[PDB]
Design a protein around this ligand. Structure first.
Ligand SMILES: CC(C)(COP(=O)(O)OP(=O)(O)OC[C@H]1O[C@@H](n2cnc3c(N)ncnc32)[C@H](O)[C@@H]1OP(=O)(O)O)[C@@H](O)C(=O)NCCC(=O)NCCSCC(=O)c1ccc(O)cc1O
Ligand SMILES: CC(C)(COP(=O)(O)OP(=O)(O)OC[C@H]1O[C@@H](n2cnc3c(N)ncnc32)[C@H](O)[C@@H]1OP(=O)(O)O)[C@@H](O)C(=O)NCCC(=O)NCCSCC(=O)c1ccc(O)cc1O
Lengths: 136, 136
């Protein structure tokens, strides 16, 4: 496994309480040996004014999963912050929940790179994102 | 003057009601002849679990300003969607509100490129972002 920090799904989900992760109902649903997965609803909290999932909301999901994945790949008092984030909005979503799957592209001593793909309920790719973190 | 749609600040702010823009108290504060400005709080709705402004929240602001600027540079039943987004998190924001300033880099027939810079209350740059839209 890639993780250096051991965490339960419960404890991972508790991290979001009282911050943006909790406010957007972002829910971590699976911790794999080398992947992390979370879902997020498409509703008033995350839509843009024309009824689509807000592009920014997709990026919130991507940066949330990638950043905490990165954090879990550090140890002790190391911190991880997002340094650069990018995404392509390949398909819109209008309802239900979307699901982001995060995998590592680079796990360095000082930086990491994470790939997050976000799918709708039909397994259709909606957002492809890449996140670069800095380890502090 | 780049705009093709005439809109008041009040009507522009009205667009965000019932969606993520209003939820996060993103407020448009100035419409220039070639710039658009909106602010966003740094609080429990937009922070990450360690107290910083969530990287994705910065992108929510960038996409919210850039996409509607894009829309305001089209006419009639034309639609604008975010296609590609990138953002550099160069300084953390921790309190108050951040201020996003959006300027056009390219205004095309079927695509636009928008630059959004987001500053903290002390005027320091915190996020530098580029949004590419498609006109439908
Ligand atoms: C349009 C693309 C960007 C490019 O692919 P392509 O080759 O150019 O075109 P495709 O052939 O692949 O067609 C794809 C689908 O598009 C539909 N459509 C076509 N024509 C029209 C039309 N005239 N009218 C309507 N729809 C049309 C088609 O029916 C088609 O459906 P299907 O055939 O599949 O049934 C596509 O990748 C896409 O939609 N990505 C998601 C974009 C996204 O959700 N971004 C994030 C959200 S927007 C930013 C935001 O958050 C934001 C924030 C605040 C704010 O104030 C405002 C804000 O905007
Ligand atoms: C520290 C950098 C990463 C590199 O800086 P650089 O290349 O050297 O550039 P500068 O030389 O200009 O330095 C600038 C200022 O920074 C200070 N500074 C330097 N070193 C340290 C340090 N070790 N500690 C503290 N401060 C440090 C410097 O002293 C200087 O301060 P001043 O004295 O001038 O007042 C900086 O670019 C940065 O903080 N970007 C924002 C990151 C961010 O907020 N991302 C988004 C949020 S995190 C991701 C997320 O959303 C997320 C979501 C869910 C989740 O579960 C978890 C999540 O994490």
């Amino acid at each position: 496994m890639i993780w250096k920090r051991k965490i339960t799904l419960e404890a991972l989900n508790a991290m979001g309480e009282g911050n943006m992760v909790g406010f957007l109902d972002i829910r971590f649903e699976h911790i794999g040996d080398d992947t992390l997965e979370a879902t997020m609803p498409v509703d008033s909290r995350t839509k843009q004014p024309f009824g689509l999932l807000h592009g920014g909301a997709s990026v919130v999901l991507a940066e949330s999963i990638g950043s905490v994945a990165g954090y879990l790949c550090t140890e002790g008092e190391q911190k991880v912050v997002g340094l650069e984030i990018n995404a392509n909005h390949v398909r819109s979503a209008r309802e239900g929940r979307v699901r982001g799957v995060c995998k590592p592209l680079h796990l360095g001593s000082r930086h990491q790179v994470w790939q997050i793909e976000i799918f709708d309920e039909k397994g259709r790719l909606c957002c492809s994102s890449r996140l670069t973190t800095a380890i502090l």
